[PDB]
Amino acid sequence: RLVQVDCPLGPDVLLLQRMEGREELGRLFAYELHLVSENPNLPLEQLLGKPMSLSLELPGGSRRFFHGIVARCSQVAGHGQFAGYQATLRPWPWLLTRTSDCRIFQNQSVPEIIKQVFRNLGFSDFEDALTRPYREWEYCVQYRETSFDFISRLMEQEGIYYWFRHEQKRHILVLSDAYGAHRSPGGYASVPYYPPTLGHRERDHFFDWQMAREVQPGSLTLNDYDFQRPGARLEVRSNIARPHAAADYPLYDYPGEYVQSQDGEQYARNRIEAIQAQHERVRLRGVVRGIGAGHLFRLSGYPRDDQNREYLVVGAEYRVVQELSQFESELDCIDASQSFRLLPQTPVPVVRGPQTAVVVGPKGEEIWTDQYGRVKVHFHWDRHDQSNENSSCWIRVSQAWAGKNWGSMQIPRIGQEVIVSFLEGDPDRPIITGRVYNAEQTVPYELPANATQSGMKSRSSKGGTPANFNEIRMEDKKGAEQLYIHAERNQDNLVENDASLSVGHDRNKSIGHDELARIGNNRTRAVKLNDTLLVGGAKSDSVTGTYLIEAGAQIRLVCGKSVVEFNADGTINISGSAFNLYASGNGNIDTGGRLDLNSGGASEVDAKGKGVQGTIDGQVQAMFPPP
Amino acid sequence: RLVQVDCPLGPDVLLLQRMEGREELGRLFAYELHLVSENPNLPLEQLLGKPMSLSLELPGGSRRFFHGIVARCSQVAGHGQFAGYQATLRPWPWLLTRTSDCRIFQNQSVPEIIKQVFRNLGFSDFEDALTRPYREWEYCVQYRETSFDFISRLMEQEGIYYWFRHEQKRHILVLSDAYGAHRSPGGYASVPYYPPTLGHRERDHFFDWQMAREVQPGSLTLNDYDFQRPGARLEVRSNIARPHAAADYPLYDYPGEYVQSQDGEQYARNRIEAIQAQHERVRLRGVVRGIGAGHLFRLSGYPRDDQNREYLVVGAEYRVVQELSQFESELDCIDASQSFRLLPQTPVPVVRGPQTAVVVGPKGEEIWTDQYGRVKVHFHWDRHDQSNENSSCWIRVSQAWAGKNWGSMQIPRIGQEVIVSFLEGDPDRPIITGRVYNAEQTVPYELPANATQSGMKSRSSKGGTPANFNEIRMEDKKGAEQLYIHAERNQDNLVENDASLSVGHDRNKSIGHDELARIGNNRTRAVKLNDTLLVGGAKSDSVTGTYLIEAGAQIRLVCGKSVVEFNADGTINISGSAFNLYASGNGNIDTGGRLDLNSGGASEVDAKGKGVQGTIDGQVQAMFPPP
Amino acid sequence: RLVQVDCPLGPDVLLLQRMEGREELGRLFAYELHLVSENPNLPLEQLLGKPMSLSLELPGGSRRFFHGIVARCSQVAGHGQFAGYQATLRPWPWLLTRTSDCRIFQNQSVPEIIKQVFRNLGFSDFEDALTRPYREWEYCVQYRETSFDFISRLMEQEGIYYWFRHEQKRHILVLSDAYGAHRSPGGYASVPYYPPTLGHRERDHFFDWQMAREVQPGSLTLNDYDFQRPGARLEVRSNIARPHAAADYPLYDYPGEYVQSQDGEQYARNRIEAIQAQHERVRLRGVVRGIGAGHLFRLSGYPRDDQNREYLVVGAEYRVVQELSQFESELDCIDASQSFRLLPQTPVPVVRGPQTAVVVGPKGEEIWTDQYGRVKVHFHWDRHDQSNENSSCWIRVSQAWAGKNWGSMQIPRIGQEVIVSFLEGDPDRPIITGRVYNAEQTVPYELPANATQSGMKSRSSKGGTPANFNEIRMEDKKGAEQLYIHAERNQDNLVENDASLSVGHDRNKSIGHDELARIGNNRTRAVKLNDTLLVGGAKSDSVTGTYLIEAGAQIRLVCGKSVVEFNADGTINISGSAFNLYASGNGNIDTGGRLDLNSGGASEVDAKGKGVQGTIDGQVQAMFPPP
């Protein structure tokens, strides 16, 4: 008979003067309510945000309900006979546009993610009628977007759409990815067409009709890149053919958000089907009260036999007026044999540039990586994690030089700050592109005092202190240049062929304990001037062959009171306290001049203070002073 | 009586056939004029771009002026007696959309910056009626945007809004941030409401009314990151409560562009109040003449008690029709107790990627940094500076590896070219992410000739030349590999524990001056074959203990004419010019065979060319040839 | 008389009930057809996507053709005798919106590029009427955009625009850049104006007329940066003056995408002329059937003398009404003396973040660069190249540190993966900003096992194996620290002034072949304890001066059976098998006590196992074990 209102503040209190609105798959509905009352001050705030329910009486005594909430309301001028109120009726997912956040999801399918969101925000009136399996997303990020947009975006991408089901007292969001999740309203399995020139038919029926066709792209090719399998062919392609001319235009995109060719196939398919869903659209007008968006119906009685087929309502317009009554609707539908998909109309969030982040990992670790050198980080905007190994997925890190098991590598450690870039601005594809210092992670050299210094200084792990490091430092200060190398422990310089060391001026070497040198073949040393050797212990030279000691002026052998002097002019002096010259065989003592014995011609040789144990020791000790 | 005109080319020349237009807080007004005149060729260009005043005669003999600039004009069809002319009036800030530029502002508050813009372009008709304190911006950039847009988004961000004051001969932009900067028109302190059912009512009044309410977000949380205080909690939150349900939806954003929590608080508050300003708005229609955007008035006589309150005119529409006189206005108002703020409508400029820049500093410096290793640069687009130390703010510089007071460091120098990235595309957040070479800053090695070389080569400063550098160079050329290390001055290799040097083939060492080595404990050297030593000066060995010299075949002591030969078979030859064997005590000479004196059995020993000073000298000089 | 239709299915089948059309320079034409037919179900797919043309009865029996392609079609309600059908006609370039791709163009002018696109997609119905010379683009990229958008964008940038020429059987795309490429329709060289107050003139004529003038910017300054000439002044400026007030507002942009100042001039000029093309627009209404977009005509008979001038039809609107014949045309025109240019309305594609790519070059190379260190890469999305040296243009590569002929040097090699950034997101300005390891390009050390290792490992080229590399490795493992250096061939350490080596504990040195050392001046060595020397060959000392050998306790000379012992207490023992003491001159043998001969006082001195050839040999070879 009419439309009855069932709402807060009383049902009969508000009479529906008229209603106008729209339904559509994958979208939020909207209805304009023009309501009138007797109460001139009917509290708008007691309706705003509240559940509403329209009761349309249908044939057979059944009823169609329109449940939702008052997104917007208004009080308007009216008449002494009535108070005027208006309301914008919207579905509860609309409230997800009133809230926003940033958030990382890990190891979840999109269906699960959506459910997660609804649960997080206290919603329960929804139902999963999905039939297709979905890939598990390792890393998916909500970023600078509303919760609604996030959801919508995911659904358009994954090829999931939704429609609503109404119960007098609640509003249900049904998820679907198949025609099988759709239903025909009771008594509206098929709706007849009655050529409007015949006059208005009392039975619910159609009277207007239009079919539109448009040239769409015939093929979509996607691509991506998996660094774990670099040479793999990830190119995928989906094709849909149409009978008309010029139906073979290709599309190509990159990246397609997949690592498996199977996933790529699905995504390509979803997108090209969404496009192809626009190839043919059918518009009908009638007074049909039971059919809305998401419903299935079969057209009958239309002259052109071809059009008497089952359709899926993808959208609808409504117009209701009441007097104190008419009901008009317009349907927008497609051939039910077509695979309905949503068009990518929801904006995609883009990271507009680099962000800083902190490297994180397990509480007992210092360094945390894997076989690819990837690391995990904590983004400053992530207010929901615990700054640990569950913060984010593994992230590849740019190095100074990469190559086939060679190049440079300087793995970042926990607590260090890094610059994160995103491939094509996509929040789901982070990569490390630089290391930075901050007030905690300070620079290795005091600045600007040491601004002329550069280099690399490492740090022992685990438990290293400021004194535990290896470094290579370069000092460019004019007139005080330095190349400094420090090894915390051992140092090993291996040269496979020839090595060379050249020092323009002074070279010092100091070794705390033992030195061992071994020369493969020959060794030649030359000193242009003096060569001093001080030995605090004992010295032992052992030559397998000939040991030639040649001097150009004088050879001296001194040992306490034993003194031997060999002069270049042939003078040989030998002094001691006693001597024992012995031959097991014959001995000759010949002179060219006179041989004298006990004559007084020979005497002690002045050792000049040499060969004195105490003095010698002092000289050695002077080379090794205490610290 | 009517609306009069005061403009270039006359006042009574053009007659206002009709006017329609709009006013709005924080926005530019627009008035559409339909003007007519007896002069069929009234030069459009002599009106275009010029000041123009309209004058609405008001009650009490006062006048409402509309002063603006003919942004656009047109010659249209008209009558015989009066030809048609059209004009669009816009406020002088509109002209700031006709100009664009890239600029950097430093150490200035937004109020100051905006005023600076107006001064730069010759504008003076504005007034500062701001009251709250504002943050001083260290660095703020105008980039690829119009001057208008620049100041527009600054005002949105800071919660600054404006309205205009009209004087017969000029147009004033008044800056505002509180209701205290707003005024009620003379005689329009309060405006009565009368029912539209009365048809015509002569006194200025309202007759239409509508109040709209909409569900808005309830809370806003902002965040940011200050590298100078990394662990600080910059998270801030602002909350505004409404009496209706579903008023508790949170928003979250990042970065909020602040470093103090106080500042963040105020930015959050501004944003959420802007949103809340849309929660409730009132639409009024009436014939008031003096009330426009930015004016205050109190509604009176409206049946519903709580509608009779003070209002702020947010926006307004006007309609004027004059027969050759009707007047109508519609107002968009809010409750004057609410804090009016502008919505973020103005597009924000985003740097779409990296840019190159040159490192700059003081004329007498080559390196210019601070305690965090930051540097200053000159952007290529900044054509309004002197490439000096004031060209930009300090910029964080990425490094190869950054840790806690350790890591790698290579500070940019003046004149070097770098790659600058912007955090989240924000022009106000530059960061250096790479160093590059150019035609002036040439590469270390000639390419592609030395493309197989890699490494690091420094440069002495200040005042260094190409010959003053330290380097570590690697040559990968197959079959000619090289590891080259060079120190401009001093080199210091320090190993805490064990060091090792292994050379597969030959090793050469050359030292220009002195060499000194000290072995803390023991030293052993082995040479598989020959060991030659040349000493240009004197050699001095001093062993505290035993000095054992072994030979496997022969020991020779040669010194000019003195020759001593010790053979492994026991033969001891001692030849000299003379000798002096002496004991201070007893001396024994014993033979197993005969002891023959002056027998002729002994003779000179062949020195074999050894022991000759000149020869020895020559050999040393051979080892040390001239340069 | 009427409009005839030349179409598929038969020209006598469709009846054009009415038509609405839109034409415009640089844009796609659109015509709305409303037509009917005796066939109640005339196959829409047999018209969709096909060629079709209208034929408007012109004076002299000539015809105006409207050739185009049915972009869209629809079947609607109609008459009973004639069913209703609708169709939208569009230009064949419209089909380029149905396809997309990514693609690199190199060394081609824009005219050439556009033609290449048409050829690639099988189109030939176009003409080149360009009069201006164009710049050859080194590198130009189609990216994530439709083919139409790509060429549209290029034309806006270059100041190229187009219009269509209709032939009975085809739709011609004419490229143009000067008024000389435009034409006046036969009999429509000049079109007369008659006042609308005359009701109607039978001859084709104009009757409505408007002129609009608007304030536009007066000057444009562009800028860019050429790294090959860093100090160049690429700043350019173009100025256009208008006679009205305030015609002097400057614009500034960066980058202008040019390297020559001459080219910059052209681009600046194009942009400002496009802006200035909107300064003055003229609106005309008439029944002129022969004039369309791109045509030239002179206005005649307009009362204002100044308007009787030549015009260029920038755009047009059409209305056709038939009956079972009305015609109306509205034109947008500009003064033909103005330089028409298109306004930047086509969305410019932008890279939203970094991408990865592979370094490529010639088949026989490992390294491929130039004098600036630039490289060639292969982008993953460029499915049309051959992964060789022609895959892209030269790209500058970021380095760790870049200075004036000094700094770091690490050149990417063929097959390595790098991170590519785009300056300002412009696809035509790539730059390498990182280097990344992948499943083929593996990390230098096994991870996470060696996560505590860092450093640089190089690789010999060409043809180097895993064992052919130079490296510097640092090990931070706590308690196992190591600094490892490895030279595959030669190593050369050159210190200009002083060098120092300090080792806290032991130092080992092993050299495979010969060692040679030369000390410029003095050398001092000290050993706190023992000093052992083992020589497998012969040892030879050549001291020019004094060779002083001191011992604090004992000197021993041992060789085979010859033994000499010098004790600190003055005891000198000399033992051999035989001896030959000889003086060329005099000899003295003196004692203080007794001088005994053959008394038995002296005896053989123990060698204590020293001086044995076999033993010595064993000791030497023990230091040099096999292999």
Whole-angstrom distance, CA of residue A344 vs CA of residue A275:
9
**A320 and A345 part of one domain:** no
CA distance B68 to C215: 14
Torsion of CA A587, A591, A592, A594, to 10 degrees: -150
Angle between helices A147-158 and A110-120 (to 10 degrees): 160
Instruction: Decide the pairing of beta strands A471-475 and C453-457.
Output: unpaired
Gaps in chain C (C to N distance exceeding 2.5 A) after: 324
- Structure letter (DSSP) for residue C97: G
CB A532 within 8 A of CB A619: no
- The residue count of chain C comes to 627
> Dihedral (C-alpha) A453, A458, A463, A468: value to the nearest 10 degrees?
-60
Exp. method: cryo-EM
Q: Residue C94: helix, strand or coil by DSSP? A: helix
Neighbours of A197 (CB within 10 A): 8
Query: How are beta strands B310-321 and B396-397 bridged, if at all?
Result: unpaired
**Spatial distance between the Cα atoms of C268 and C286, rounded to a whole number of angstroms:** 37
CB environment A93-128: b (16+ within 10 A), e (fewer): bbbbbbbbbbbbbbebbbbebbbebbeeeeeebbee
Residues B85 and B97 in one domain: no
Contact A490 C500 (CB under 8 A): no
Contact C470 B451 (CB under 8 A): no
B411/chain C closest Cα distance in angstroms: 8
Cβ under 8 Å to A: C residues 523-542: 523-542
- The shortest CB-CB distance from A526 to any of B396, B403, B623 is to B623
Burial of C542 (0-12, 13-18, 19+ CB in 10 A): buried
**Residue of B197, B278, B488, B567 to mutate when probing chain A, most A C-beta within 10 A:** B488
Q: How are strands ordered across the β-sheet holding C250-252?
A: C236-239, C219-222, C250-252
C-alpha C189/C-alpha C311 separation (Å) is 10
A458 token code pair = 């490492």
CB contact under 8 A, B524 and A533: no
Neighbours of chain A (3+ CB pairs under 8 A): B, C
Return the residue matching tokens 């219009």.
C163
Closest CA relative to residue B340, chosen from B297, B308, B309, B311: B311
Long-range contacts of C301-310 (CB under 8 A, 24+ apart): C301/C192, C301/C193, C301/C194, C302/C193, C302/C206, C302/C209, C303/B40, C304/B40, C304/B41, C307/C209, C307/C211, C307/C282, C309/C335, C309/C336, C310/C335, C310/C336, C310/C337
Could you say which DSSP state residue C290 is in?
Answer: S
Q: Which of C553, C561, C570 sits opposite A578 (nearest CB)?
A: C570
DSSP B318-367: EEEE----EEEEEEEEEETTS-----S-SPPP---S-EEEEEE--TT-S-
The one-character DSSP state at B294 is T
Helix axes C147-158, C110-120, angle to 10 degrees: 160
DSSP B376-390: EEEETT--SS-SSTT
Which residues from A are below 8 Å from B431, CB to CB?
354, 419, 434, 436
Distance from the Cα of A416 to chain C's closest Cα (Å) equals 15
Question: With the C-alpha atoms ordered C256, C257, C262, C268, is the resulting torsion angle positive or negative?
Answer: negative
Residues C287, C407 share a domain: no
> Residue C534's domain spans which residues?
449-627
Through-space distance between the first and last CA atoms of chain A, rounded to whole angstroms:
109
Nearest Cα residue in chain A from B544:
A536
Residue of A nearest to C627 (CA): A520
Q: What's the number of domains chain C is made of?
A: 5
Tokens encoding B475: 């040559």
* Structural tokens at position C468: 């052919």
Q: What is the DSSP string of A550-586?
A: EESSEEEEEETTEEEEEETTSEEEEEESEEEEEESS-
* A 348-407 → C contacts, CB under 8 A: 350-351, 367-373, 396-407
Q: For residue C290, which amino acid is it?
A: G
Sign of the dihedral defined by the CA atoms of residues A283, A287, A290, A292, in that order:
positive
Q: Give the chains touching B; criterion: ≥3 Cβ pairs < 8 Å.
A: A, C
**Pick from A228, A247, A279: which residue ends a domain?**
A279
Could you give the CA distance from residue C221 to residue C240 in angstroms, rounded to a whole number? 12
Are A402 and A312 contained in the same domain? no
- For residue A45, give both structure tokens: 């705030």
Conformation bin of residue C107: beta by default, left when phi > 0, alpha when psi is -120 to 50: left
Report the residue of B588, B599, B608, B623 to disrupt the C interface, i.e. the one with the largest count of C CBs within 10 Å: B588
- Label the pairing between strands B280-286 and B326-335: antiparallel
C41 in contact with B, Cβ within 8 Å: no
Cα separation values, A164 from A174, A337, B205, C524, Å: 6, 21, 47, 96
CATH of the domain at A209: 2.30.110.50
Measured between beta carbons, which residues in chain A are less than 8 angstroms from residue B231?
A: 440
d(CA B12, CA B587): 150
| Chain B (479-508) residues lying within 8 Å, Cβ to Cβ, of chain C | 479-508
In degrees and rounded to multiples of 5, residue B166 shows phi and psi of -105, 130
- Axis crossing angle, helix B261-276 with helix B147-158, rounded to the nearest 10: 100
What is the phi/psi pair of residue A13, to 5°?
-50, -35
Q: Which two tokens stand for residue A428?
A: 């789901």
Rounded CA separation A308/A323 (Å): 36
Nearest Cα residue in chain C from A598: C590
C124: helix, coil or strand?
Answer: coil
Quote the tokens at residue B468.
């003053």
Residues 6+ apart with CB under 8 A from A457: A444, A469, A470, A471, A473, B406, B407, B408
A320 & A423 share domain: no
Considering A416, A441, A466, which residue would you say is the last residue of a domain? A441
Q: Taking the alpha carbons of B476, B480, B486, B491 in that order, is the dihedral positive or negative? A: positive
CB contact under 8 A, C537 and A526: no
CA distance B225 to chain C (A): 22
In a shared domain, residues A486 and A508: yes
Q: Which of B385, B394, B439, B398 is nearest to B415 (CA)?
A: B439
- Output the domain CATH number for residue B262: 4.10.220.110
Residue C448 tokens read as 């996470």
Let me know: does C77 contact C86? Beta carbons within 8 Å.
no
Report the alpha-carbon angle B449-B451-B456, nearest 5.
120
Contact between chains at C602 and B588 (C-beta distance less than 8 A): yes
Task: Give φ, ψ of A174 to 5 degrees.
Answer: -100, 125
Asked if C524's CB is within 8 angstroms of A370's CB, the reply is no
User: Is the C-alpha dihedral spanning A328, A330, A336, A341 positive or negative?
Assistant: negative
Do B285 and B222 share a structural domain? no
Start-to-end CA distance of chain B, whole Å, equals 109
Mutation target to probe the B interface, by most B beta carbons within 10 A, among A519, A565, A596, A608 is A519
Look-up of token digits 């620079």? A443
Quick check: A585 and B579 CB within 8 A?
no
Whole-number Å distance between alpha carbons of C286 and C283: 10
Q: What span, in angstroms and rounded, lies between the C-alpha atoms of A77 and B377?
A: 63
Instruction: Give the nearest partner residue to C403 out of B49, B413, B511, using CB atoms.
Output: B413
Residues in chain A: 627
Same domain, C580 and C603: yes
How far is it, in rounded angstroms, from Cα B14 to Cα A345? Answer: 50
Amino acid code (one letter) for C126: F
Residue that is written with structure tokens 């090894």 in the block:
A487
Of the residues B477, B495, B619, B623, the best mutation for testing chain A's interface (the one with the most A CB atoms within 10 Å of its CB) is B495
In the 3-class helix/strand/coil scheme, how is C341-372 assigned residue by residue?
CCCCCCCCCCCCCCEEEEEECCCCCCCCCCCC
- Rounded distance, CA A192 to CA A206, Å? 6
Q: Residue A520 half-sphere exposure, CB side, CA atoms within 13 Å?
A: 16
Q: Which two tokens stand for residue C202?
A: 């039978």
Q: d(Cα C466, Cα C487) in Å, to the nearest integer? A: 14
CATH of the domain at C366: 2.40.50.230
* Cα dihedral value B459, B462, B468, B474, nearest 10: -10
Q: Are B207 and B149 part of one and the same domain?
A: no
Residue with tokens 């050392």: C517
CB-based contact B551:A546 (threshold 8 Å): yes
Using DSSP, state whether B524 is helix, strand or coil.
strand
C449 CB near a chain A CB, below 8 Å? no
Contact A578 B595 (CB under 8 A): no
Which residues of chain B have a CB within 8 Å of the CB of C461? 452, 476-478
- Per-residue buried b or exposed e for C249-284, using 16+ beta carbons within 10 Å of the residue's own CB: bbbbbbbbbbbeeebbebbbbbbbbbbbbebbbbeb
Mark whether B243 and B111 lie in a shared domain.
Answer: no
| Contact across the interface for A354 and B462, Cβ inside 8 Å | no
CA count, 13 A, side-chain hemisphere, C574? 28
Nearest to A185 by CA among A204, A172, A171: A204
- Residue A594 touches chain B, beta carbons under 8 Å: no
A589, containing H or E segment: strand A587-591
Is the CB of A566 less than 8 angstroms away from the CB of B570? no
Pair C550, C529 in one domain: yes
Residue with tokens 């490192």: B359
Q: Which of C338, C366, C385 is the last residue of a domain?
A: C338
User: In C, residues 81-140, which contact A (CB 8 Å cutoff)?
Assistant: 95, 98-102
Tokens of B431: 């960061």
Q: Determine the Cα–Cα distance for residues C63 and C289; give it in Å rounded to an integer.
A: 10
Q: Is A63 helix (H, G, I), strand (E, B) or coil?
A: strand
Give B 597-626 residues with CB within 8 A of chain C: 601-605, 613, 616-617, 619-620, 623-624
Q: Which residues of B touch C580 (CB under 8 A)?
A: 571-575, 601-603
For residues A150 and A93, what is the distance between their CA atoms, to the nearest angstrom? 12
Amino acid identity of A584?
A: S
Instruction: Kindly state the helix (H) or strand (E) to which residue C294 belongs, with its residue range.
Output: none
Identify the residue whose tokens are 């840790």.
Answer: B403
Interchain proximity C502–B493, CB inside 8 Å: yes
Label residue C232 exposed, middle or buried (CB < 10 Å: 0-12, 13-18, 19+). middle
Round to whole Å and give the CA distance between C208 and C518: 105
Residues B572 and B625 in one domain: yes
Question: What span, in angstroms and rounded, lies between the C-alpha atoms of B395 and B388?
Answer: 15
Size of interface A-C (CB pairs under 8 A): 663
User: Which helix (H) or strand (E) is A204 found in, with range?
Assistant: none
Q: Are A601 and B580 in contact (CB under 8 A)?
A: yes
Q: Cβ contact (<8 Å) for C564 and B569?
A: no
- Cα–Cα dist B351/B367, whole Å: 28
- Strand C531-535 to A539-543 pairing: parallel
Q: What is the resolution of this structure in A?
A: 3.2
Cis peptide before A59, with omega less than 30 degrees from 0? no
Which phi and psi (to 5°) does residue B350 adopt?
A: -130, 125
Do B479 and C443 contact (CB within 8 A), yes or no?
A: no
Residue found by looking up tokens 């073949």 in the block: A521
